[PDB]
Design a protein around this ligand. Structure first.
Ligand SMILES: N[C@@H](Cc1ccccc1)C(=O)O
Ligand SMILES: [Hg+2]
Ligand SMILES: [Zn+2]
Length: 257
């Protein structure tokens, strides 16, 4: 099974998922001096007021906070997007040390972690059909740096003890994703892919420039999770990030000047 170790990590993914060496793979390094401000971009709209979380799950590579997407409750639109994208789940990527963990990098800078809010284009009916389209998904990426604690994240942190191992899930209702957002919505955008197998190239990436700060204690809690299942040798869930991939024939647009 794919993972982040030496024998099943990112360098091995292309074997089971050839698209790993595709033309629009993510993450990528965001070179701020090559990214161009795009006037055609409309303001970004993040509407999470009616978000309805359902459960939190440890899938062996990260933990997913799932949402009820049977209705337009939590949506993303505007910016580089055409139409409406519904929030289906969010998760993080983090390191074993504060100096690494993010997937996208800014001028080669690696953040301690990165949050990915995954949304699917409503014109496709469901997530399954959406990931069969070039504009099927929109992922809002938010960098995490270690400093002050993030209050809106503590609820996630305190439930991790109940889903320490692969396969474990816990009721995670009434979680407000708005508490994970930074002040500014300035962002960089480019066409990309999911950063975990199957690495589908259906994502319009919207990476926020402003990182959120989380405490050392909070990230340390992330690092207590296990990649392994209950009863198996303990392998700490850390460094579950894919490195920057070739930008190839792509242009990163900045929503700001
Ligand atoms: N390997 C997982 C990858 C995944 C991660 C997160 C959400 C959905 C899927 C799969 O069965 O999907
Ligand atoms: Hg696609
Ligand atoms: Zn991700």
């Amino acid at each position: 099974h794919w993972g982040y170790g030496k024998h099943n990590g990112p360098e091995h993914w292309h074997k089971d998922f050839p698209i790993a060496k595709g033309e629009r793979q993510s993450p990528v390094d965001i070179d701020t001096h090559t990214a161009k401000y795009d006037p055609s971009l409309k303001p970004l709209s993040v509407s999470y007021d009616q978000a309805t979380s359902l459960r939190i799950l440890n899938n062996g590579h990260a933990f997913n906070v799932e949402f009820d997407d049977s209705q337009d409750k939590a949506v993303l639109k505007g910016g580089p997007l055409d139409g409406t994208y519904r929030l289906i789940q969010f998760h993080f990527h983090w390191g074993s040390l504060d100096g690494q963990g993010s997937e996208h990098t800014v001028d080669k800078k690696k953040y301690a972690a990165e949050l990915h809010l995954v949304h699917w284009n409503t014109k496709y009916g469901d997530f399954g059909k959406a990931v069969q389209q070039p504009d099927g998904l929109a992922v809002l990426g938010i960098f995490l740096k270690v400093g002050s604690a993030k209050p809106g994240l503590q609820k996630v942190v305190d439930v991790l003890d109940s889903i320490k191992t692969k396969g474990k899930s816990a009721d995670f209702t009434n979680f407000d994703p708005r508490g994970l957002l930074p002040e500014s919505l300035d962002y960089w955008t480019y066409p990309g892919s999911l950063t975990t197998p199957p690495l589908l190239e259906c994502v319009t990436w919207i990476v926020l420039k402003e990182p959120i700060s989380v405490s050392s204690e909070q990230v340390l809690k992330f690092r207590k999770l296990n990649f392994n299942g209950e009863g198996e040798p303990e392998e700490l869930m850390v460094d579950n990030w894919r490195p920057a991939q070739p930008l190839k024939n792509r242009q990163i647009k900045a929503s700001f000047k």
